[model samples]
Target: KVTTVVATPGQGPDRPQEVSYTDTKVIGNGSFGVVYQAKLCDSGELVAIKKVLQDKRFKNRELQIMRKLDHCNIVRLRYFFYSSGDEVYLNLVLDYVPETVYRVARHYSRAKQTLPVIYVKLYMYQLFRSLAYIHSFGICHRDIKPQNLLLDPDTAVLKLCDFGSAKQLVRGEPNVSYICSRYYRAPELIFGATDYTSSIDVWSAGCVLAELLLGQPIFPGDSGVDQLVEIIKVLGTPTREQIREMNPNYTEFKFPQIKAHPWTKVFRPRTPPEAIALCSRLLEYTPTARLTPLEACAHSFFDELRDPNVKLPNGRDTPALFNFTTQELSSNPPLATILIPPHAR
Candidate 1:
């Protein structure tokens, strides 16, 4: 059925207006609920409607957070409305991007081709910038795997999507330990750490970068136990001190001692040293030891992005990368010197 609702724009003034959409079709579905692709009746622009079951007892955190977030690399929420049936559903209307990094990477994997190095730098660079922006505001996007990265094929613009697992983490507040997807789950999270920082997202982002460097998942664990085993195989067993850093409550520490695998050997021999260096810093067992998102942005791995002549494979100038907003620059003044090149200024 064509739907019309009194809705408010995701940004700007809050005056509610009547909005209509039609040609609805289910585009995706999961435990969260169903996502439908539809056209705005007036503008004819495509939008995604994520309809999830809502508990009237409380407001939706995802809606609250998305409403406040405005970034070039973050998906934009267009409007939100409530629908009634056997129960209430909260519908979030969002700007639609046609591709995901997962799908893009899978295409390359199937064709037995690695994603171009330049593309990897482009995608992961934007991802860190997005993380830096959100983390500055205390928001942790608990899920940071390839699936959550939306890609515009034409412009090669990547936007971080899926806020269902996002939260503005407060210091000293307890949170669920078993969050984030399996492959990208931080080691601290796997160790059942309730008290974790936004660096968990940084760890996940590192996993995404590693996956792109290799043609498959860097840690291909089947379950929680197996995941840790896979991680230990590469990163080696966490030390007692590292274990305590992750979770003080974790008492059992006896495990087989294995030497850490060399990062150079982990990826294709041609993988750049700077890429491996950044990954080593990010995938560390100690959560706090991981590079801050802003620091990762300034890493040598992304220096190519800062070059004035850098352009997309299609010969188009790269999407707006160095246009750091005042709020974004305010997060780390020291890094601003490295983030924005003189050519960009």
Candidate 2:
């Protein structure tokens, strides 16, 4: 079957385009919309089209953010169109990646194994890089989970895809607390504090790293509590001083008393201390205490990625790790010295 539509390039002018495609099929779905994978007849390039409701705010805001983002680790939005009927729908044409971190991590889990530590480091360091890029723009992904991290194992390239979300945060204004993936929502958001955030991505990054190392499906959330989110903060137990700002109302609830100890034993004993160390920095009770993505990038855990000798265990070369831009550097020039290796220049 063939499909064609009048679409607009994601960037630049508002002119509509006539294009054709074939082999369109559903690749994923959510309450937000359905995504279909298809091939463009003219270019022979496979693409994913997100067919989502053209209701107020969703299309314009999300599209606006996706349009402005142009990082290697972030997915690209190619074109978009609107279909009319009883209601309206917005279609986003996007670069298609073949697998997600979730699927690959699950593959390892079911095979009686864990993801290679280097790959975990590789995937996560890029994740932080992407986070650093977007956070610089003050665009909160609002949903940073393993499933959103797209990967092509052959090339070891990971691109962040699908936010259907991308609200620019206002520092002094109150935003939704129930924002990010429940599993990845930072401690501050969980307790209903709003204003000045991005540490949420840091927390979610920690979760993804923990997932790959521990070998699990999505982090399990019980009916009301997100246990691991708190526990993995080394289970420090929320402090009165911390709770003073988050949500003053619920001081009555008693949190588990891990006393923030034994995070080491949580993952396989052989797990790298640096990996765990990065997670410790990411999953903090106080949002500001979490390392900025650049800080996470500079951590010793990713020092191996900066080393020239490093390559995928398959003997293939790794993806570009030191693609530093002025944005990433001025964000931290002191760290860029380390972030950009000798050969990277």
Candidate 3:
């Protein structure tokens, strides 16, 4: 049924207005809920409405987090309203980016060509920026995978999406270890560490970067246990100290000692050394050893992005990479000089 509701704007004051939408069709569905593609009657802009079954017992955490976030590389939540029928449904209206990194990578894979290095740098740089923003607020995006990264094909703008598993992490509070997608799961998460920090997202981001570089998943495994095997195959067996760092309670360490696979051999020989260096800093077994998002952003790998002359292969200007808000810039003042290039400043 076509519906109109007085929905509040996502970021501003509580001045709600009538929002009408039509041509609604289910676009995707999963355990979280269903997503529908629809058109706004006023602006005629395509939007995605995420409809999730709501429980009366508690508030919707994803909606809460979405409302609080405002960043260029993060999906925008336009409006949200509740519907009542048999069960209460919370529907979120969001900007609909038509493509995803998963599909983009798959397309290149099908064509038997690796995703261009420039595109990889562009996507991963923005991802790190997004992660930096969220991590500044002590929020952990538990699931960081290609499918969760929204992309605008023509503009080559990448936005981080899917906050279903995201949470504002508290130091003393416990969280579930079995979070994030299988292939992107961090070593600490695999060791069942409930006290892990946002660095888990960093590990997942590293996996995505590796996947884009290799044109396939870096750690493809059948199960959680098997996933660790895949990680160990490359990182080599985690040392006793590393294991303790991942999960202090994980005491059983009965695995063969395997030599660490050189990052040079892990990817295509043509892969840039900078990319490999960045990945090495990110995929470390010790959670604290993984590079922080902003740190990754300042790495030499993204130096090309700081170049004033660089443009996307499509011959269009790269999306705004250095438009740092006061909040973003304030996160790391020392890095500000590097984060905002001379040309951008």
Candidate 4:
């Protein structure tokens, strides 16, 4: 511990003496806290500081989990300071991301947005590896959206951040109603199902995959119901029986009223055929039935979209921003690939 300071969020009369806070600038803000770019004069290193209001409810839990995590994909934390007053105050120090998000990387145009295929593949690979590491260690990054995926503008390396709702998966244990962001939330979660597995994170990965290609969220609805409905409208409704096939106890789920489309009219994207196939397998309905990151990395879509010339980072902290080798990840059937849904590709 560099410096351990114990304080509280609010202290009026008996507050501690003035302390030094140097070179601080507001960089981001969330509902419960504000983030700042700061530096430690003693160490001479730059860091992003998350200042949280104890009353906001994510102070200690997030800090505790983040402090223990050390992975290339997850954000790295240097140290933290906490208070236990009427309102707790938490100051977390983190590494800064280098580049603009993939959306801004494409000049921030909603209508004509795109990411270089090579970089998108690399980004997804890194995210998948990170999820693999987290899941292996019994952690689930419930929140898995683009905003949480930070980019190093200088290096174009991607890093996963924000563990606000992350939970450790305990085997033989069950819980209800802990959910993630609506757009990226797994289908089982959408239908009020719980006791999910690591596949939930993979389902979120599928959402991220679509967002990278489309340059906006794939399921961009105003509400959870709307998001689920949008998903069903694109991918035909999974029947109640199918739900039972996925999980026997899932009969109590509130499956939305989704109208199905005929298989005769093949709903596929006009773009590259490889892209469509990869997205379909990724966005599965059952949380436990989603593809593993390792499998997604091997999809034929990457084979068509990958560029072998891109450079990768070799350092422990930096992500290997490149595609997996064909030999390393086996390829799927060429013509058997699923067609991209209408309007999605």
* Cα lDDT listed for each candidate: 0.90, 0.80, 0.91, 0.63
Better of 2 and 4 by lDDT: 2
Q: State every prediction's TM-score relative to the real structure.
A: 0.97, 0.92, 0.97, 0.74
List where candidate 3 sits over 4 angstroms from the true fold: none
Per-residue C-alpha lDDT of model 2 across residues 117-230, encoded as one tens digit per residue: 889889988999999999899888888989999998898899998777667887777787677777776667666666648777888888888888888733466633564344
Better of 3 and 4 by lDDT: 3
| Most accurate candidate by lDDT | 3
- State the lDDT of candidate 4 residue by residue for 1-345, as single tens digits: 133344222212334333234677899888858899866565667778788887554446776677567666678876566655477678777787755454454564455646666566667767876775566557788888777888875455678888878888786687454478888877777665556777887878878777776666767767876676767776667876656544533344365666654322322235455555666777777555567766675566655323433354432332343322332233232312321212222
Which residue pairs in candidate 1 have backbone atoms (N, alpha carbon, C) closer than 3 angstroms, thus clashing?
none
> Residue 315, candidate 4: how far off, in angstroms?
18
Best by TM-score: 3
* The 10-residue segment with the lowest total lDDT in model 4: 335-344
How badly does each model clash, as a count of residue pairs?
A: 0, 2, 0, 8
- In candidate 2 the C-alpha lDDT for residue 223 amounts to 34
Rank all candidate structures by their lDDT, best first, as comma-separated numbers: 3, 1, 2, 4
Worst 10 residues of 2 by lDDT: 223-232
lDDT of 3: 0.91
Q: Whose lDDT is higher: candidate 2's or candidate 3's?
A: 3
